Amino acid sequence: AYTLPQLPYAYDALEPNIDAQTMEIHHTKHHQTYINNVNAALEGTEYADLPIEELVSKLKSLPENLQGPVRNNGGGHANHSLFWTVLSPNGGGEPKGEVAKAIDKDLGGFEKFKEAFTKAAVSRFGSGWAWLSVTPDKKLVVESTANQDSPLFEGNTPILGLDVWEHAYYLKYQNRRPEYIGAFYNAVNWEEVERRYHAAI
Amino acid sequence: AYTLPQLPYAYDALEPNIDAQTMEIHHTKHHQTYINNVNAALEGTEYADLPIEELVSKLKSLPENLQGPVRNNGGGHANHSLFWTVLSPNGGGEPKGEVAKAIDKDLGGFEKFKEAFTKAAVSRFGSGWAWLSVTPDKKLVVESTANQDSPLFEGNTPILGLDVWEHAYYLKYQNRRPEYIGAFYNAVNWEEVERRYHAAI
Ligand SMILES: [Mn+2]
Ligand SMILES: [Mn+2]
């Protein structure tokens, strides 16, 4: 019974970092499709009324005939829902508050985090995501996942994510993913990232 | 070392099925990069003077440090080299010769083959390829692979392939991968596919 969340901003609010056409297609076409696909698979089951984050966390405990649809399409839903919120037309800059202090203590500083985040995003071959996550031991880790796999079913709570599927950047950047990653930094909503960190802890 | 093969046709020869801009970017940027990367990984090794298909076939026997680069970038080189040859500005229609008879005997007919090929191409979640391949027992199979994985290192010989990485279709088709798959049928060079079948025997 999931529905498409409204973006916190207009489709063209992230220019010149992300083009308006991509934001609209990514939202109304790609994200909608994940939501429709997981809704059809969950219909008539006892798992149809769970929050998306809880469902994806319990992936391995689901029946065999549901794991495929939930991993890919439920994964797509949770990941893109998070993605839209950690971007902002007034984003960029450096983190502050406790996420800054956690980045300093856990990852060795903002400059080291970006080095690791960029490497993870560049090194993901094929479709996937780069993540900053909170572990069960309440520490930050940088990681990447394939396709729509989410750190949620690995026990981690992602607080920042970058979509590196080619549909997220090909219209404006074509093959130049490093350039796209550089633009992502200019749009990161660190106030939202701080919010998610407080909740994960 | 490997070098970028010239296309058998102009960059706009496949219109209206594949756009000229994509053909140029796909060839001169994406394929070139695979070639550059696998050449760098092979430099100074005992594998630097092998045909790419032989190299990719022997993937599982390569040293650990070479398996990643050859799988992804050598796979990328082999897959795209095949791809360019099985497209044609005068393609489409139905297969003929020995591959046609094999499609009837092994796959149940051209209509059944397209049904299976389309399903494999549509259902490949993330980046990948849809394939018509010849098995070690010399029969036809429809299959799909992830990223640049090639049926070659699983013992199969691909004779026809469709790239369903989003970079292969997003500029013209955006999210409409089914539309792209339908157009691909119009551009297939079945004369080349027959040659590849005969060579696989
Ligand atoms: Mn996406
Ligand atoms: Mn390609």
Closest to A201 measured CA to CA, from A105, A133, A108, A109: A133
β-strand partners of B163:
B129
Cα A145 off chain centre by: 10
Distance in Å, CA B125 to ligand 1 centroid? 12
Locate B25 and state its tokens: 């970017």
Question: With the CA atoms of B144, B149, B154 and B156 taken in that order, what torsion angle do they form, in degrees rounded to the nearest 10?
Answer: 60
Name every chain A residue with its beta carbon within 8 A of the beta carbon of B167.
166, 170, 174-175
Locate B20 and state its tokens: 């000229």
A195 neighbors A170 (Cβ within 8 angstroms):
no
A143 neighbors A159 (Cβ within 8 angstroms):
no
Does B89-201 match B19-88 at the fold level? no
**Can you tell me the distance from the alpha carbon of A143 to that of A133, in angstroms, rounded to the nearest whole number?**
8
Give residues with Cβ within 8 angstroms of A11, minimum separation 6. Answer: A20, A23, A24, A27
Phi, psi (deg, nearest 5) at residue B135: -85, 170
Would you call the peptide bond into A51 cis, given omega within 30 degrees of 0 as the criterion? no
A187 neighbors A17 (Cβ within 8 angstroms):
yes
- B119 sits in which H/E element: helix B110-123
Q: Residue type at B141?
A: V
Q: How many CB atoms lie within 10 A of CB A174?
A: 20
> Is B132 strand, coil or helix?
strand
Q: Which CATH number fits domain B19-88: 3.40.50.620, 1.10.287.470, 3.30.70.120, 1.10.287.990?
A: 1.10.287.990
- Minimal CA separation from B126 to chain A, in Å: 5
Distance in Å, CA A17 to ligand 2 centroid? 25
Cα A11 off chain centre by: 18
Name the CATH topology of A89-201: minor pseudopilin epsh fold (3.55.40)
Say yes or no: A171 contacts chain B, CB-CB below 8 A: yes
Phi-psi sector, B146: left (phi>0), alpha (psi -120 to 50), beta? beta
Q: What b-and-e string marks burial along B134-156, b requiring 16 or more CB atoms within 10 Å of the CB?
A: bbeeeebebbbbbbbbbbbbeeb
Distance in Å, CA A87 to ligand 1 centroid? 14
Locate B77 and state its tokens: 């080189």
**Can you tell me the distance from the alpha carbon of B154 to that of B56, in angstroms, rounded to the nearest whole number?**
10
Q: Domain boundaries in chain A? A: 19-88, 89-201
**Can you tell me the distance from the alpha carbon of B136 to that of B115, in angstroms, rounded to the nearest whole number?**
23
Nearest CA in chain B to A129: B126
**Can you tell me the distance from the alpha carbon of A86 to that of A8, in angstroms, rounded to the nearest whole number?**
10
Locate A137 and state its tokens: 């031991």
DSSP string, B146-173: ETT--GGGGT-EEEEEEE-SGGGTHHHH
